[PDB]
Ligand binder design. Structure first.
Ligand SMILES: [Cl-]
Ligand SMILES: [Cl-]
Ligand SMILES: [Cl-]
Ligand SMILES: [Cl-]
Ligand SMILES: [Cl-]
Lengths: 181, 181
């Protein structure tokens, strides 16, 4: 049956890695996140790669106000990346920014892995990070990022070029957002 | 017994009105909010009137990141004030900003009343706004400000210079934050 947006986007994510285009993206910047988003969602959402102008929320949580989102992103992208703790803090702020109308979670997890890979030579082995534990750690993270830090730290891998880790991690990441083939 | 910080601050709030200094403050601006805060807390908190550099949270809610708080405040203070709906929206954003380490609620409710008074010739009759209903409306407000809008609209008064409304409203406002003589 015709591919859904999420299914085609998962194919786009796989291609991002298969083609090597993943490693030609800016790391740790707003523009690099936009690049990822455009690769994942170009042709699928008209706003692929575009910073939102509208406010968004999920549950009882409102993401950063569009009114000062661009200003926030400039500060976020200048945050340091030299330790695991710093990188998670930067990720937590980029999640709070949530700069697109859709596709924030999936694009920003790829973004995080590029920052980890560049600075620590590690990535998250997402296939081993449960959806329930991830989502609860993310919900806690604005106030206290310790649960998220430990969850991700416990699931780091140095096998950053392994196909199975990459592809199973894409699958897991998309499953966090509700998609399973 | 020696006055507490909250007790002396309540006296400062009363004096702000008794002296007429209330009506010599900028309305609807960050600087005007700082002015209120300095009047309420000067001599009590070393940070009276000062924009925080640290992050703060209450419950599972983190207020705007200090990292981009100044940038946020510039946008917030430029929000329009010509309708009740606009004024509540501006207030909701200033509450999310929560720009001081302490004293945000009390200072920002005075700030709100000055905006209402200037633009609508009304203020909130806080003595009639229950603490429980206020706090639940405020908790909902980042996502949906309708409950807050209706609660405050239902409690507006045109008797903006009435001593009892003013002084009982200060008392109620301080009680929202836990202080009762
Ligand atoms: Cl930090
Ligand atoms: Cl997503
Ligand atoms: Cl925020
Ligand atoms: Cl608005
Ligand atoms: Cl307060």
């Amino acid at each position: 049956h015709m591919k859904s947006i999420d299914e085609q986007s998962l194919h786009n994510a796989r291609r991002l890695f298969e083609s090597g285009d993943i490693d030609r993206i800016e790391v740790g910047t707003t523009a690099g996140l936009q690049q990822i988003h455009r690769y994942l969602f170009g042709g699928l959402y008209d706003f692929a790669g575009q910073i939102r102008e509208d406010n968004i929320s999920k549950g009882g949580f409102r993401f950063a106000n569009a009114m000062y989102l661009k200003e926030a992103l400039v500060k976020i992208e200048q945050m340091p990346e030299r330790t695991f703790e710093e990188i998670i803090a930067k990720y937590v702020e980029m999640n709070i920014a949530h700069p697109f109308l859709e596709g924030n979670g999936r694009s920003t997890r790829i973004w995080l892995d590029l920052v980890l890979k560049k600075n620590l030579k590690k990535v998250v082995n997402w296939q081993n990070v449960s959806k329930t534990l991830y989502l609860q750690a993310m919900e806690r993270s604005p106030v206290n990022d310790l649960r998220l830090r430990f969850l991700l730290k416990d699931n780091l891998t140095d096998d950053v070029d392994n196909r199975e880790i990459i592809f199973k991690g894409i699958e897991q990441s998309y499953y966090y957002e509700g998609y399973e083939k």
